[PDB]
Amino acid sequence: MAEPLTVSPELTANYAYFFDLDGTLAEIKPHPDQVVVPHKILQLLDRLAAHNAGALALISGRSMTELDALAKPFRFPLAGVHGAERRDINGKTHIVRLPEAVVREVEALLRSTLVALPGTELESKGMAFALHYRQAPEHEAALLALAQHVTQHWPQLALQLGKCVVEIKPKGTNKGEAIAAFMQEAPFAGRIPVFVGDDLTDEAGFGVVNHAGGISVKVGVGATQAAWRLESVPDVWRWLEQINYP
Numbered sequence: 604m605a606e607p608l609t610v611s612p613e614l615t616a617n618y619a620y621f622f623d624l625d626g627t628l629a630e631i632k633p634h635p636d637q638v639v640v641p642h643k644i645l646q647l648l649d650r651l652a653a654h655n656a657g658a659l660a661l662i663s664g665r666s667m668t669e670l671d672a673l674a675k676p677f678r679f680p681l682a683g684v685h686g687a688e689r690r691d692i693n694g695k696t697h698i699v700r701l702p703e704a705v706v707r708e709v710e711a712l713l714r715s716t717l718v719a720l721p722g723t724e725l726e727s728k729g730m731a732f733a734l735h736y737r738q739a740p741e742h743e744a745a746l747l748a749l750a751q752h753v754t755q756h757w758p759q760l761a762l763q764l765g766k767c768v769v770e771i772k773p774k775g776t777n778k779g780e781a782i783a784a785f786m787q788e789a790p791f792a793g794r795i796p797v798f799v800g801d802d803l804t805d806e807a808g809f810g811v812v813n814h815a816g817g818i819s820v821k822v823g824v825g826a827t828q829a830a831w832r833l834e835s836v837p838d839v840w841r842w843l844e845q846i847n848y849p
């Protein structure tokens with residue numbers, strides 16, 4: 604039901620911008636360290652933010668340290684780990700804390716499965732875990748069942764499926780709540796939210812933005828509750844250059 608996106612905001616309208624990273628601003632790569640957001644795209648994102656009082660944020664599943672590496676030399680307001688990490692316009696961070704016993708126990712369980720299944724990668728994010736299987740898609744059902752068992756035994760953890768990944772996150776964390784936290788703070792408050800995403804984690808953000816009277820944009824293929832659709836990452840790049848230089 605999503606319609607092709609044909610709104611190109613004027614550079615200085617009353618919008619608040621929210622951008623996913625992987626699959627949205629940078630192309631999918633076999634390993635996260637190979638991902639790059641081109642320098643021109645970052646300048647366009649920085650120029651878009653400056654003309655909208657700084658109301659532009661990156662809402663990603665990655666940790667904030669990885670986002671700062673990808674966005675260097677620019678420093679944006681961020682939401683990391685699907686909302687469990689957030690940094691507002693003043694640089695103040697908001698972090699969800701899990702008990703040290705839970706993180707230590709769940710990593711030991713996952714590591715004992717992931718050493719013996721070739722091609723899978725266990726990513727530790729402090730208060731969350733990502734089970735990558737892009738290089739061995741045969742292991743999808745086993746990893747999904749493994750995370751389901753983890754989230755039933757530790758109720759403080761919740762499941763977050765993604766593209767070639769099965770993630771485990773603190774319960775109550777989602778990109779919709781991360782966007783909500785920004786939308787009550789300056790300079791985002793008072794503006795119309797725009798959110799551009801590509802994966803299942805972004806659906807929670809699409810939902811809140813739709814109800815808020817904003818603009819939700821799905822990137823790529825797949826069913827979505829987002830109202831609008833862009834075909835690929837280069838179409839995000841082209842749209843982003845169209846906002847700046849009509």
Ligand SMILES: O=S(=O)(O)OC[C@H]1O[C@H](O[C@H]2O[C@H](CO)[C@@H](O)[C@H](O)[C@H]2O)[C@H](O)[C@@H](O)[C@@H]1O
Binds near residue numbers: 634662
């Ligand atoms: O900003 S988000 O889109 O929310 O990112 C959400 C996820 O994005 C990254 O993983 C994705 O990108 C990789 C390289 O492109 C792919 O290899 C991988 O299969 C794909 O799942 C990170 O590693 C994850 O920790 C993160 O939670």
Ligand SMILES: [Mg+2]
Binds near residue numbers: 623625801802
């Ligand atoms: Mg993505």
